Amino acid sequence: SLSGRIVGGVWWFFTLIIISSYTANLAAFLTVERMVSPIESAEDLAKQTE
Amino acid sequence: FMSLGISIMIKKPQKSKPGVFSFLDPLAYEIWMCIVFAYIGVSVVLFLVSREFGIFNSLWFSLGAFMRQGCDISPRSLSGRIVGGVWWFFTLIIISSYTANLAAFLTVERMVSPIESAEDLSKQTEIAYGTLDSGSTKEFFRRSKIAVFDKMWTYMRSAEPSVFVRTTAEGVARVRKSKGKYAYLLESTMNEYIEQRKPCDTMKVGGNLDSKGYGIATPKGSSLGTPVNLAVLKLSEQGVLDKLKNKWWYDKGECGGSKEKTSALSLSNVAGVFYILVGGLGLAMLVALIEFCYKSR
Amino acid sequence: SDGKYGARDPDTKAWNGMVGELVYGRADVAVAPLTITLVREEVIDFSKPFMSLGISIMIKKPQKSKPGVFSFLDPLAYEIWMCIVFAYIGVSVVLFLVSRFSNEFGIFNSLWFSLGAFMQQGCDISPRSLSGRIVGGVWWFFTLIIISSYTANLAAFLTVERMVSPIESAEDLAKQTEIAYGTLEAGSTKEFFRRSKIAVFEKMWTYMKSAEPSVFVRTTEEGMIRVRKSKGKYAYLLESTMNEYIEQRKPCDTMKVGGNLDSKGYGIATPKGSALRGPVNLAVLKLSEQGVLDKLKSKWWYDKGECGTSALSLSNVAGVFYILIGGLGLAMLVALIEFCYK
Amino acid sequence: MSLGISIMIKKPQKSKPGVFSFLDPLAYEIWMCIVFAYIGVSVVLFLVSR
Numbered sequence A: 001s002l003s004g005r006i007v008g009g010v011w012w013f014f015t016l017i018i019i020s021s022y023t024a025n026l027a028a029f030l031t032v033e034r035m036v037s038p039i040e041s042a043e044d045l046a047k048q049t050e
Numbered sequence B: 001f002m003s004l005g006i007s008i009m010i011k012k013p014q015k016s017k018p019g020v021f022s023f024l025d026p027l028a029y030e031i032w033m034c035i036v037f038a039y040i041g042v043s044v045v046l047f048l049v050s051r052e053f054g055i056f057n058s059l060w061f062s063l064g065a066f067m068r069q070g071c072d073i074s075p076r077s078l079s080g081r082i083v084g085g086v087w088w089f090f091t092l093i094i095i096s097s098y099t100a101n102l103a104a105f106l107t108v109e110r111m112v113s114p115i116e117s118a119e120d121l122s123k124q125t126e127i128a129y130g131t132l133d134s135g136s137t138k139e140f141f142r143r144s145k146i147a148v149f150d151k152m153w154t155y156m157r158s159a160e161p162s163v164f165v166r167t168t169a170e171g172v173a174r175v176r177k178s179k180g181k182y183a184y185l186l187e188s189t190m191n192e193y194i195e196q197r198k199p200c201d202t203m204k205v206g207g208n209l210d211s212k213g214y215g216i217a218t219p220k221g222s223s224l225g226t227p228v229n230l231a232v233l234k235l236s237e238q239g240v241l242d243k244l245k246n247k248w249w250y251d252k253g254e255c256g257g258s259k260e261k262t263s264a265l266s267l268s269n270v271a272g273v274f275y276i277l278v279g280g281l282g283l284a285m286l287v288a289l290i291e292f293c294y295k296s297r
Numbered sequence C: 001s002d003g004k005y006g007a008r009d010p011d012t013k014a015w016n017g018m019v020g021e022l023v024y025g026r027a028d029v030a031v032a033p034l035t036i037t038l039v040r041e042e043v044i045d046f047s048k049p050f051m052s053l054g055i056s057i058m059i060k061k062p063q064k065s066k067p068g069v070f071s072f073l074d075p076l077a078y079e080i081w082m083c084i085v086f087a088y089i090g091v092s093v094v095l096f097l098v099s100r101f102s103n104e105f106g107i108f109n110s111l112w113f114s115l116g117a118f119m120q121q122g123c124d125i126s127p128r129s130l131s132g133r134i135v136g137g138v139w140w141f142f143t144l145i146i147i148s149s150y151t152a153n154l155a156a157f158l159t160v161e162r163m164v165s166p167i168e169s170a171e172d173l174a175k176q177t178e179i180a181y182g183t184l185e186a187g188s189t190k191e192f193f194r195r196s197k198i199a200v201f202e203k204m205w206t207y208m209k210s211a212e213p214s215v216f217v218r219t220t221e222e223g224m225i226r227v228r229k230s231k232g233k234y235a236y237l238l239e240s241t242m243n244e245y246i247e248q249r250k251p252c253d254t255m256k257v258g259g260n261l262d263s264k265g266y267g268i269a270t271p272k273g274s275a276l277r278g279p280v281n282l283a284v285l286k287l288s289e290q291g292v293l294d295k296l297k298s299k300w301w302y303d304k305g306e307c308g309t310s311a312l313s314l315s316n317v318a319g320v321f322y323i324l325i326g327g328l329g330l331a332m333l334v335a336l337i338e339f340c341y342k
Numbered sequence D: 001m002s003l004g005i006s007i008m009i010k011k012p013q014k015s016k017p018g019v020f021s022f023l024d025p026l027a028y029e030i031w032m033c034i035v036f037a038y039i040g041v042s043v044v045l046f047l048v049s050r
């Protein structure tokens, strides 16, 4: 029916955004985490304040 | 011995709050509307191609196709399967393109300034701008030949309310408190010093408007004013003036490493889609009730 | 007469050019773009400065990168897109054979099942037998890897593209080797560079001395051509005033970038012991404060000139719309053919 | 024996990942509201369907 279809369509639009947001955020989480360098040389000390 | 001019200062751009419908940021507003029109076209064509599939039934098929869920509606005609398969390929690229662009936003964040130049805040006409009550820069604004500052003096004079402060220290305080609502105009020299000092919440933007300079003053006659004028010119060439200005401005300062960390998503930025859900649910109840109500009579 | 700015020979003090004509006194005063130095201040009397100059950077203007009309098929190479089509045929044919053997999977339906799997849009009918199931399972495993590889590669493509910075300040020049930079063969620019006691401009000149080809160019105008020829591989340092004018007049493929580095001013000169210093020096200040120079500088540079959101654009996806329309075009023709037949 | 000036930092401790370090992308208050919405969607669907 028409009443059953309209509630189904919004639940479909809800799903597609929640899933894609979860994937992209996890992609950003692992990308940042692996491109980090520890304080190795004296040059690294020279350009750090924290 | 050094040159200067009148420049613009604003509060640091910082980070915005995402309100509602902030999830439509990855794609342009042009593309979204094109998808709406296109899906009507595909639905209409499917009906005309066929002559079961009506107007209502065809529209549902192409909605279920874009959301990427499998129903029980399948075009059995050869002509319809050319339509269906082509519409499927569209769906696959749009979804994949969305996901990719959203990942780029949350990897590296760019805070971009709202205003670029003096001609920018001439057109924007949103954020307040003025000078001191009475000074050198105030007198410059009053008497102007060119149209751009003449239009600016029109704003400065007939301001509601008057955008004028007593001290230059008051001007800086008004910029930080307003939070992107007031832009102060003063000398470029002081502006660069205030940016380097604590706690760092303002920066220089654009070029200078006029060109002035400081010098060494000496009484009339000037019997001893000749040699010291020549010596400064030589020390300008050697690069002692640049060395000394670099020591007090830049060397001795509060803020100088940029370390970014990805934070978890809060409810506020996804809030948009939640209102759409419950709104659609309430609408479904309304239509079902009146469909029964007039069927009874 | 000479055509030079003003320089004295080291042997004989024979001043050539503009200042040379002033020293003995052929002319009263001079109005020319001439810088002030300690050397020049002794022999000729300089007035107050009217226009301030500085050393700035000139690169080739980044051309408007119009995206390819099919710039959405970049992640995967052409030979892969070829082999997906070949495999798609081979899968359907095999499925068709093993399904019906002495079945709903006809030649038409088995072809429809294979597309539905790759596009990720479910299915109408599932394979019933063992032979049909095993070929279906591998085609499912193929699909899941190809799709996910395409999404991840496009994610990497856009991530890198947005985190790039152009050569803005002199610090960016100091830490770059790919984009070369050089000045004139001889002048006030290179002379400043030698006795430069700065932060990292001493390191800048250290690199300039030892280069593979000759970075120093003889002519200034020919030096501008070298930047054009390189196309974003060479940068030419010069005065700011000359740099801004070169962008305006002549074909537009250049621009100024960054702030001024050095401090130097033009002036108006007349030999010492002149009574003309009084009214002229004050007149210069009268012009500047009221704003005569600033209006005049606007005219000859700009008025008499011959030049002049970061979401996913429509152009990047534009291509896939042409596929959508072309498909519906064929769809109408198929309806046209089989109506005349029946 | 030869000597030199060197750097001494605190040793990076063995970062044992959380046993539920896969629900980091989305915050706790979102995961709560997905469950609430899921019930509300089903009940409304059930009513207007029959």
Ligand SMILES: NS(=O)(=O)c1cccc2c1c([N+](=O)[O-])cc1[nH]c(=O)c(=O)[nH]c12
Pocket: C005, C033, C034, C035, C036, C187, C188, C220, C238, C239, C241, C242
């Ligand atoms: N044409 S140029 O490329 O820009 C240029 C190149 C080299 C030296 C210049 C110079 C200009 N200038 O701006 O015409 C003025 C100027 N004035 C002086 O007093 C001096 O010593 N050297 C110069």
